[PDB]
Design a protein around this ligand. Structure first.
Ligand SMILES: *C(=O)N1C[C@H](NOS(=O)(=O)O)CC[C@H]1C(=O)NOCCN
Ligand SMILES: [Cl-]
Ligand SMILES: [Zn+2]
Ligand SMILES: [Zn+2]
Length: 358
């Protein structure tokens, strides 16, 4: 890699790892469209297995960027419209509070207070219907953004219904395969488990547990190489030969709502570039990112703006992830770690690196 990249990555990430006690980490810096890879530490501490460019990490909520793009691809196929009512795809959702809640609301956390998590006791399709049938909104739809796995998770499950495919099959056929993300998995196959890093929480090795709508909201695992290719695909959608997927990538970066200086896409979130670094750093703290905030609609949604900072945080019990990129600059970063450490530390490090290379 260019010396300037090696230098800034060492001076930023090695101290981050020292400060946060991260056991293993992989970073890709995309500079002028090309990825440069860096690894540190161990995927499995007790086995002394190093992190490599083939190590699988839990992406956590970064999974929502795949869900948003798959939803965009369905829009581009004419299979769904964001203005469609939820009940078009789930007519058994007969409770009156669902009148007026659209796929857009589900995708963008604006349905009126769907909760952060689907309850752990939801184990069957019957449980899931009961959950949504009994949920009572705190706000009218399209007025407040409250980040929620139960919201975008339902969006992903319903967006694939017209295809007749399961969510996993749709994602594999329509997103992973065309983009050659051949080491990205909703369910890690047995032959690939050797590459699956352990997450570390309070010193103990952990993997994410199964849960309702997990694939849609937080369940994807991937390598640093596939995640760099995911960033390249979102930086340069016109390089994608499949027109519906090219368009789905673009639609996931459209701006549907604004609150403060942030814009909500499908999975992705965006700010105008140049960005105020303190806004992205401070805004990533869970106390802020997860709070209910009023939104203003953008109608029509702003088509993807090249001069944007586009990003997403993610975590599981044992992992912490961050992806950010700037289309106009062909510049991006992926940071995958097997410890969940605070979002602001991730974003600060990412901005120090990308700011140094702009
Ligand atoms: C995503 O990783 N999520 C949802 C929510 N996202 O906040 S973020 O990581 O800062 O963007 C916080 C919790 C977290 C999870 O739900 N992770 O999955 C673990 C099992 N629920
Ligand atoms: Cl140094
Ligand atoms: Zn040093
Ligand atoms: Zn392989």
């Amino acid at each position: 890699a260019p010396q300037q990249i090696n230098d800034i990555v060492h001076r930023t990430i090695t101290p981050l790892i020292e400060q946060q006690k991260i056991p293993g980490m992989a970073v890709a810096v995309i500079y002028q469209g090309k990825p440069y890879y860096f690894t540190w530490g161990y995927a499995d501490i007790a086995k002394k297995q190093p992190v490599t460019q083939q190590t699988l990490f839990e992406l956590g909520s970064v999974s929502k960027t795949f869900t948003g793009v798959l939803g965009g691809d369905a829009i581009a196929r004419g299979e769904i419209k964001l203005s469609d009512p939820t009940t078009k795809y789930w007519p058994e959702l007969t409770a009156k509070q669902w009148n007026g809640i659209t796929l857009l609301h589900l995708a963008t956390y604006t349905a009126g207070g769907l909760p952060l998590q689907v309850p752990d006791e939801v184990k069957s399709s019957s449980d899931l219907l009961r959950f949504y049938q009994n949920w009572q909104p705190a706000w009218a739809p399209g007025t407040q953004r409250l980040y929620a796995n139960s919201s975008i998770g339902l969006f992903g499950a319903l967006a694939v219904k017209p295809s007749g495919l399961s969510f996993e099959q749709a994602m594999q056929t329509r997103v992973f395969q065309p983009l050659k993300l051949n080491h990205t998995w909703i369910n890690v196959p047995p032959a690939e488990e050797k590459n699956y890093a352990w997450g570390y929480r309070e010193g103990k090795a952990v993997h994410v547990s199964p849960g309702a709508l997990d694939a849609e909201a937080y369940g994807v695992k991937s390598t640093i190489e596939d995640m760099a290719r995911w960033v390249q695909s979102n930086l340069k959608p016109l390089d994608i030969n499949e027109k519906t997927l090219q368009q789905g990538i673009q639609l996931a970066q459209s701006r549907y709502w604004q609150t403060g200086d942030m814009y909500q896409g499908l999975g992705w979130e965006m700010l105008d570039w140049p960005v105020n670094p303190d806004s992205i750093i401070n805004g990533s703290d869970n106390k802020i990112a997860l709070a209910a905030r009023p939104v203003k609609a953008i109608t029509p949604p702003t088509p993807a703006v090249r001069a944007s900072w586009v990003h997403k945080t993610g975590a599981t019990g044992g992992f912490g992830s961050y992806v950010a990129f700037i289309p106009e600059k062909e510049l991006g970063i992926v940071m995958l770690a097997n410890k969940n450490y605070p979002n602001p530390a991730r974003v600060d490090a990412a901005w120090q690196i990308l700011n140094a290379l702009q």
